[PDB]
Design a protein around this nucleic acid. Structure first.
Ligand SMILES: [Ca+2]
Ligand SMILES: [Ca+2]
Length: 316
DNA sequence: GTAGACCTGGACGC
DNA sequence: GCGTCCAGGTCTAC
């Protein structure tokens, strides 16, 4: 009845999705800087907001186990087939990770070695507004801090959903909320630092200059090139943040976010250096060259392979 | 095209 | 003991 559910404590309220560990490891996907919305509130059980409801997820060897908290309006019950489809879409489970790992390991002997220890790193398919603003909060920052900033943002500006134990979950804020008066100041007091202004300015820029939510949503059907360029108009969004949004919310599997983590990987594990620029270190030209190097290496799902090596780089 | 400032807070050095 | 370096970079200025 009370508290976050576990598979043992409320057996009747879980449904499953067939899903081998080769296809998904929650512990390597959820806390690794794709989504900041999930916490392991009981060992091996991950809770967070997915498609505007709270869920807890946990896995056995062949199954992803899902439970959904709706309110108070009904009465607790197992997830419905439609609700389970939402989970499948968020994890993009139609994409067969074992196939991609095989392809990348065949063209890249170092990937093949890492892959063996880091199975099941796949990419979530995120809502565009939640992805956009969360990655705006991510620049020049670390995942533990970013996670708290996002939580406090949703608490202050998003709709309350439900409370489990002492944890209240909220939906991601709308553009309207984020574009409202005095939002920057309130975000400063929530510890967002200089990105407080970027969040307010992009929410306004989007509603009042770009065409609203439709402008962002329609980038899903635009080309990578067009989507990336569109996104860099926004305050706090440079090439790397834009790439993260392209990859993680706008269905551009070839997008490769290039930052110092990716330079470390490139130099340590590929002995890479820039060819077509004079600069020895990160710059707009050298970062652009590095992203192209990863696409040439891995092919059209290069940003997915980048997510495997990035998740591995965090486990130091 | 280069270079350094910048909110915040944990790790680590002397 | 603050002092500095760093973390899913972007913005601003010769
Ligand atoms: Ca950084
Ligand atoms: Ca920008």
């Amino acid at each position: 009845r009370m508290g976050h559910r576990t598979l043992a404590s409320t057996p009747a309220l879980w449904a499953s999705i067939p899903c081998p560990r080769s296809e998904l490891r929650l512990d390597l996907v959820l806390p690794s800087g794709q989504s900041f919305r999930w916490r392991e509130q009981s060992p091996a059980h991950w809770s967070g907001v997915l498609a505007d409801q709270v869920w807890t997820l946990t896995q056995t060897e062949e199954q992803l186990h899902c439970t959904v908290y709706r309110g108070d309006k009904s009465q607790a019950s197992r997830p419905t087939p439609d609700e389970l489809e939402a989970v499948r879409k968020y994890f993009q489970l139609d994409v067969t990770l074992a196939q991609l790992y095989h392809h990348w390991g065949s063209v890249d002997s170092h990937f093949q070695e890492v892959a063996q220890k880091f199975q099941g790193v796949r990419l979530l398919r995120q809502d565009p507004i939640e992805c956009l603003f969360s990655f705006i909060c991510s620049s020049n920052n670390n995942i533990a801090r970013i996670t708290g900033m996002v939580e406090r943002l949703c608490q202050a500006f998003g709709p309350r959903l439900i409370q489990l134990d002492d944890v209240t979950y909220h939906g991601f804020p709308s553009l309207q909320a984020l574009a409202g008066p005095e939002v920057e100041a309130h975000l400063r007091k929530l510890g967002l630092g200089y990105r407080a202004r970027y969040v307010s300015a992009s929410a306004r820029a989007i509603l009042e200059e770009q065409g609203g939510l439709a402008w962002l949503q329609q980038l899903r059907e635009s080309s990578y090139e067009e989507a990336h360029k569109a996104l860099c108009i926004l305050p706090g969004v440079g090439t790397c943040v834009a790439d993260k949004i392209c990859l993680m919310a706008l269905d551009k599997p070839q997008a490769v976010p290039v930052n110092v983590h990716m330079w470390h990987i490139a130099q340590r594990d590929y002995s890479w250096h820039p060819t077509t620029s004079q600069a020895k270190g990160p710059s707009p030209q050298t970062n652009k060259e590095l992203g192209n190097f990863f696409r040439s290496l891995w092919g059209p799902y290069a940003g997915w392979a980048q997510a495997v090596l990035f998740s591995a780089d965090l486990r130091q």
